[PDB]
Design an enzyme around this catalytic site. Structure first.
Site, PDB file in Angstrom:
ATOM      1  N   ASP A 351      37.226  34.768  32.542  1.00  0.00           N
ATOM      2  CA  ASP A 351      37.987  35.227  33.189  1.00  0.00           C
ATOM      3  C   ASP A 351      39.207  35.591  32.002  1.00  0.00           C
ATOM      4  OD1 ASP A 351      37.208  36.680  35.597  1.00  0.00           O
ATOM      5  OD2 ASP A 351      37.401  34.481  36.351  1.00  0.00           O
ATOM      6  N   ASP A 702      37.917  32.669  40.187  1.00  0.00           N
ATOM      7  CA  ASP A 702      38.536  31.864  41.495  1.00  0.00           C
ATOM      8  C   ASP A 702      38.308  32.477  42.739  1.00  0.00           C
ATOM      9  OD1 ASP A 702      40.285  34.180  41.148  1.00  0.00           O
ATOM     10  OD2 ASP A 702      40.786  33.034  38.908  1.00  0.00           O
ATOM     11  N   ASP A 706      34.429  35.851  43.483  1.00  0.00           N
ATOM     12  CA  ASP A 706      33.337  35.373  42.929  1.00  0.00           C
ATOM     13  C   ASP A 706      32.042  34.475  43.443  1.00  0.00           C
ATOM     14  OD1 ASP A 706      34.550  36.509  41.310  1.00  0.00           O
ATOM     15  OD2 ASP A 706      36.403  35.815  41.210  1.00  0.00           O
TER      16      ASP A 706
HETATM   17  N1  LIG Z   1      49.594  41.405  43.423  1.00  0.00           N
HETATM   18  C1  LIG Z   1      49.075  42.173  42.928  1.00  0.00           C
HETATM   19  N2  LIG Z   1      49.906  43.256  43.393  1.00  0.00           N
HETATM   20  C2  LIG Z   1      49.114  44.932  43.016  1.00  0.00           C
HETATM   21  N3  LIG Z   1      48.457  44.969  41.981  1.00  0.00           N
HETATM   22  C3  LIG Z   1      47.982  43.485  40.615  1.00  0.00           C
HETATM   23  C4  LIG Z   1      48.480  42.053  41.779  1.00  0.00           C
HETATM   24  N4  LIG Z   1      47.406  41.592  41.635  1.00  0.00           N
HETATM   25  C5  LIG Z   1      47.036  42.430  40.118  1.00  0.00           C
HETATM   26  N5  LIG Z   1      46.885  44.212  40.724  1.00  0.00           N
HETATM   27  C6  LIG Z   1      46.426  44.357  39.869  1.00  0.00           C
HETATM   28  O1  LIG Z   1      45.897  45.008  39.816  1.00  0.00           O
HETATM   29  C7  LIG Z   1      44.414  44.989  38.881  1.00  0.00           C
HETATM   30  C8  LIG Z   1      43.447  44.114  39.617  1.00  0.00           C
HETATM   31  O2  LIG Z   1      43.272  42.819  39.125  1.00  0.00           O
HETATM   32  P1  LIG Z   1      42.447  41.254  39.259  1.00  0.00           P
HETATM   33  O3  LIG Z   1      42.826  40.690  40.343  1.00  0.00           O
HETATM   34  O4  LIG Z   1      41.478  42.101  39.250  1.00  0.00           O
HETATM   35  O5  LIG Z   1      42.522  40.677  37.422  1.00  0.00           O
HETATM   36  P2  LIG Z   1      43.630  40.542  36.672  1.00  0.00           P
HETATM   37  O6  LIG Z   1      44.931  40.446  38.313  1.00  0.00           O
HETATM   38  O7  LIG Z   1      44.222  40.764  35.559  1.00  0.00           O
HETATM   39  O8  LIG Z   1      42.429  39.249  36.167  1.00  0.00           O
HETATM   40  P3  LIG Z   1      41.602  39.102  35.349  1.00  0.00           P
HETATM   41  O9  LIG Z   1      41.956  38.546  33.988  1.00  0.00           O
HETATM   42  O10 LIG Z   1      41.240  37.346  35.855  1.00  0.00           O
HETATM   43  O11 LIG Z   1      40.885  39.419  35.578  1.00  0.00           O
HETATM   44  C9  LIG Z   1      45.299  43.740  37.853  1.00  0.00           C
HETATM   45  O12 LIG Z   1      45.251  43.756  36.061  1.00  0.00           O
HETATM   46  C10 LIG Z   1      46.754  43.757  38.184  1.00  0.00           C
HETATM   47  O13 LIG Z   1      46.987  45.796  36.862  1.00  0.00           O
END
Ligand SMILES: Nc1ncnc2c1ncn2[C@@H]1O[C@H](COP(=O)(O)OP(=O)(O)OP(=O)(O)O)[C@@H](O)[C@H]1O
Ligand SMILES: [K+]
Length: 991
Positions: A351, A702, A706
């Site tokens: 990740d 996490d 997953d």
């Molecule tokens: N709290 C939130 N509210 C709204 N949109 C969010 C939120 N957190 C993340 N997102 C968005 O949508 C996407 C999906 O997040 P996701 O958890 O699947 O991956 P990530 O947050 O980018 O972390 P990782 O690199 O571990 O995948 C994110 O990249 C972000 O743009």
């Protein structure tokens, strides 16, 4: 309590006299701490010595030593002779192995039961309780939880105790009770009483059962049952009895023990066979018919000589102390078999957010609409300073400071950020810094709202604590969040339903939305310009996305969010909130407001760690939910991709990957280093492809979603700051969440297994030598050189200490310059097998010759001949050939002392050889491992104190030899260093 599910929240709270908002008090917990015991399950140690001796089924051989002496005591009464002093001395030899075998089983195994627990001890089961210590939530050990405590739980949390729910904070709470009930779908909960007292757990819907976990939502409750009183506890039956798959190493060891155990017969068959009751034999020979013990004592000596009795103790100690060393390096190992697998890792799927990046987020950029010129548009772009979570910084436009309140779009922007948010800032007075509560991404939004101060709130004169939420509070005073549509990884957005506190005469309720810019902006039919609302045109939509693309793919590699509001949302009564899959339908016809982008820099050591993986033949694949532009840019900054590298077939969004043909999907999993905008289904899909390539894959995760991939992967790796659900599904936990810790764990797994190859090849080698020693004595006919009492003490003490210290040898300088180890790697190779024989035959002959040196030739030995010794059993006063010779010397503690002292000095030499596999000692001096040198001295001192402390040498049948005789030991021992060194040189500069 009895019927807690039937009682009301006020009724169960009353039964313990506890306030829902302040929890139990300091002494009240002390009061319940004596009544209920801890929340721990009383795993029975049993401290069962008496019945451990009854179990002890491990050594089959030395148990067969028990049988001939025990029943034969019928002879002790009917024994023919007057012998007294020489009578009962020998039976002590047979019985002591039995008494000592109890120690072999007990002392080694209980330390293993402690090992499994020692893994859990580094990361204790936690739980969020409320008590009178702090007004906020308090995180304590799960075992310190007593009935009556107020517990808070959220998605991914393991339920620490049986709990009667009190309040549900989210719209809905779903629990995965699959460990308790057979239900494979998450069950929905409430706070109302369940009037049926005989209701099953499936129907007690106001309860949280210990051992279950939260699938979705957040809630509070009061503890009802702990420990054995737990619904699951009383049962404790559905368990198997430690049902586990032997590691590829323990299998090879178990296999090597089962093949050679049959080979014991090959030598044993050769002995018993002899009697061959002579079918044509004279009637009177002076036959010695009492000879039914000769093949018996040898078979027992063989078994003690063929089995590495000390091996399991050294292995258990090596893993346990290695794990602690790993845990110190922030790799917490949940499963001991993983340490072997870890070294074989060929692919790490990592990740991005918080693992490759630092997870220290700050919003440095944002924009809103300025003008709409027909099909085109202009934006108001802003920068924002300060990179920590401190709510201190300036907002600029074209590097000039601005009043945010002037822009109606910034007021809405900040409102969305304040409201569609579950996080907060907290000022740590002790550390003097602002810290985050909740997600980093959201807290950045919180910190942004304070800097924007869009209502021009007076901040001068507020404490550090007040400055944390001050502007956020103001927005919350004007606009009330009624409920939220929680973030889900499928639509990658979040919304909150909000209404003004002032009665409006018009609808005036809104849904504030934030999410991945691609999806959110696709669901916007209009754009907000200041306070106006005009329809979104594709020219405008293209402008917005281009800037967003530029922010994400630049050198700052900005994590971007789009912000929008629904001006005409449906009422709560028209929405089905039980399922996140419905939420994307409600977030549509949106009005786009603006975007933000936030720093999340790469970790400093990650680039080097990625280079290290390349050197070690480990492919690295980035996996993220974030934007593909952002993902690829980080991949370039940390070296997964080159600065100028063409990534067109090496990087894919989840959707792109899904739209590829199977052939192309296979190519992607072969060649792609970056998967972006993924869903939890993609990790499993990727692991499945990697397995079809026979890769050994480390996958990180996490979240609750997953768990399947973490279970499916050969090494599941959970974040320390992540959910408990993920941790339970994983073989290792990164205490610091850092990618580098994965690489450091792999290096350790490679090193620990290398040291295990040594003390296995070292302890087995001593056994190989002991077998040909006993064979040499039987074949050459000579008297007994070594007795099983000496072999046991050597294999447990003389060989015991250096073997353990062997587990602590320093890793090779090129240990990460070699490809991943094949899990099918043979423990011993062809050339390595020649190392067995070359050493085995050496110490075998070196101990028989040493016992026959004091006999045949020496100044101070009786000086027999070869034929006199080979036939020592014929030493009688009537045999013509044994004439003018004494038989008393054939049994003496001196020749056995020579053989033992040679065996001991040989192993101390062979231990130093085993410091490295192929590296000569000249460049790998013995002090390279200090614990090894200190190990030789402690064992040698244990060999000196076995002579000069009177009770010891008597029971061991040894006597301290002369200084002159001790020098002969060195003459035949030290040269083993030369032979092994020659065997090192040969492979090195030849093989
Ligand atoms: N709290 C939130 N509210 C709204 N949109 C969010 C939120 N957190 C993340 N997102 C968005 O949508 C996407 C999906 O997040 P996701 O958890 O699947 O991956 P990530 O947050 O980018 O972390 P990782 O690199 O571990 O995948 C994110 O990249 C972000 O743009
Ligand atoms: K797994």
């Amino acid at each position: 309590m009895e019927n807690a599910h039937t009682k009301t929240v006020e009724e169960v709270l009353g039964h313990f006299g506890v306030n829902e908002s302040t929890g139990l008090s300091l002494e009240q917990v002390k009061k319940l701490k004596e009544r209920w015991g801890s929340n721990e399950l009383p795993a029975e140690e049993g401290k069962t010595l008496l019945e451990l001796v009854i179990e002890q089924f491990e050594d089959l051989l030395v148990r067969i030593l028990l049988l001939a002496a025990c029943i034969s005591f019928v002879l002790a009464w009917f024994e023919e002779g007057e012998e007294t002093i020489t009578a009962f001395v020998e039976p002590f030899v047979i019985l002591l192995i039995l008494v000592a075998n109890a120690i072999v089983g007990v002392w080694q195994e209980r330390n293993a039961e402690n090992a499994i627990e020692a893994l859990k001890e580094y990361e204790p089961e936690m739980g969020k309780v409320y008590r009178q210590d702090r007004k906020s939530v308090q995180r304590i050990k799960a075992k310190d939880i007593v009935p009556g405590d107020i517990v808070e739980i959220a998605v991914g949390d393991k339920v620490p105790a049986d709990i009667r729910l009190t309040s549900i904070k989210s719209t809905t709470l779903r629990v995965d009770q699959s460990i308790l009930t057979g239900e494979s779908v998450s069950v929905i909960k409430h706070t109302d009483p369940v009037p049926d007292p005989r209701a099953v757990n499936q129907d007690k819907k106001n309860m949280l059962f210990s051992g279950t976990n939260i699938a979705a939502g957040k809630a509070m409750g009061v503890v009802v049952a702990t420990g054995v009183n737990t619904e699951i506890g009383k049962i404790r039956d559905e368990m198997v009895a430690t049902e586990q798959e032997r590691t590829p190493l323990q299998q090879k060891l178990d296999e090597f023990g089962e093949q050679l155990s049959k080979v014991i017969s090959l030598i044993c068959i050769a002995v018993w066979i002899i009697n061959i009751g002579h079918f044509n034999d004279p009637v009177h020979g002076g036959s010695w018919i009492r000879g039914a013990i000769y093949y018996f004592k040898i078979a027992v000596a063989l078994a003690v000589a063929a089995i590495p009795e000390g091996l399991p103790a050294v292995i258990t100690t090596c893993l346990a102390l290695g794990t602690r060393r790993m845990a110190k390096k922030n790799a917490i190992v949940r499963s001991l078999p993983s340490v072997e697998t870890l070294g074989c890792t060929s692919v790490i799927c990592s990740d991005k957010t918080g693992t490759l990046t630092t997870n220290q987020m700050s919003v440095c950029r944002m924009f809103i609409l300025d003008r709409v010129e027909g099909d085109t548009c202009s934006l108001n772009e802003f920068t924002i300073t300060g990179s920590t979570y401190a709510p201190i910084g300036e907002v600029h436009k074209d590097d000039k400071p601005v009043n945010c309140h002037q822009y109606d779009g910034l007021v809405e922007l900040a409102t969305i950020c304040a409201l569609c948010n579950d996080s907060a800032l907290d000022y740590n007075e002790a550390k003097g810094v602002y810290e985050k509560v909740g997600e980093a991404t959201e807290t950045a939004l919180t910190c942004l709202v304070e800097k924007m101060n869009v209502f021009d709130t007076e901040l001068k004169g507020l404490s550090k604590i007040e400055r944390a939420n001050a502007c956020n509070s103001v927005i919350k005073q004007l606009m009330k969040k009624e409920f939220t549509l929680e973030f889900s990884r499928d639509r990658k957005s979040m919304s909150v339903y909000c209404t003004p506190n002032k009665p409006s005469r018009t609808s005036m309720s809104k849904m504030f939305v934030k999410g991945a810019p691609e999806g959110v902006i696709d669901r916007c039919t209009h754009i907000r310009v200041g306070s106006t609302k005009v329809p979104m045109t594709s020219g405008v939509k293209q402008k917005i996305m281009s800037v967003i693309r530029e922010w994400g793919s630049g050198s700052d590699t900005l994590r971007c969010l789009a912000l929008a509001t629904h001006d005409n949302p449906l009422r709560r009564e028209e929405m089905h909130l039980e399922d996140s899959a419905n939420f994307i339908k409600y977030e549509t016809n949106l009005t786009f407001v603006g975007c933000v982008g936030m720093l999340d820099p790469p970790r400093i050591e990650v680039a080097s760690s990625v280079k290290l993986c390349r050197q070690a033949g480990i492919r690295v694949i980035m996996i993220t939910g974030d934007n593909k532009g952002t993902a690829v840019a980080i991949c370039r900054r940390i070296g997964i991709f080159g600065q100028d590298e063409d990534v067109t077939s090496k990087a894919f969004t989840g959707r792109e990957f899904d739209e590829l043909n199977p052939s192309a999907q296979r190519d992607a999993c072969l060649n792609a280093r970056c998967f972006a905008r993924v869903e939890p289904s993609h990790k499993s899909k990727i692991v499945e492809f990697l397995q079809s390539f026979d890769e050994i894959t480390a996958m990180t995760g996490d979240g609750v979603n997953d768990a399947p991939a973490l279970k499916k992967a050969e090494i599941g790796i959970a974040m320390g700051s992540g959910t408990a659900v993920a941790k339970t599904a994983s073989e290792m936990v990164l205490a610091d969440d850092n990618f580098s810790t994965i690489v450091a764990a792999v290096e350790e797994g490679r090193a620990i297994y290398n040291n295990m190859k040594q003390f296995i090849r070292y302890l087995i080698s001593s056994n190989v030598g002991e077998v040909v020693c006993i064979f040499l004595t039987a074949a050459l006919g000579f008297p007994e050189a070594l007795i099983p009492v000496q072999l046991l003490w050597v294999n447990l003490v003389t060989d015991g200490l250096p073997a353990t210290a062997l587990g602590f040898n320093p890793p090779d300088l090129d240990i990460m310059n070699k490809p991943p180890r094949n899990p099918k790697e043979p423990l011993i190779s062809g050339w390595l097998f020649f190392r067995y024989l070359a050493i085995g035959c050496y110490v075998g002959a070196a101990t028989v010759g040493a016992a026959a040196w004091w006999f045949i030739a020496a100044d101070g030995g009786p000086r027999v001949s070869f034929y006199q010794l080979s036939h020592f059993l014929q030493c009688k006063e009537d045999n013509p050939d044994f004439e003018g010779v004494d038989c008393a010397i054939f049994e003496s503690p001196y020749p056995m002392t020579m053989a033992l002292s040679v065996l001991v000095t040989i192993e101390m030499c062979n231990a130093l050889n085993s410091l490295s596999e192929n590296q000569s000692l000249l460049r790998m001096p013995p002090w390279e491992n200090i614990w090894l040198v200190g190990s030789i001295c402690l064992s040698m001192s244990l060999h000196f104190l076995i002579l000069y402390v009177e009770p010891l040498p008597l029971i061991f049948q040894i006597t301290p030899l002369n200084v002159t005789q001790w020098l002969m030991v060195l003459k035949i021992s030290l040269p083993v260093i030369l032979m092994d060194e020659t065997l090192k040189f040969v492979a090195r500069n030849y093989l």
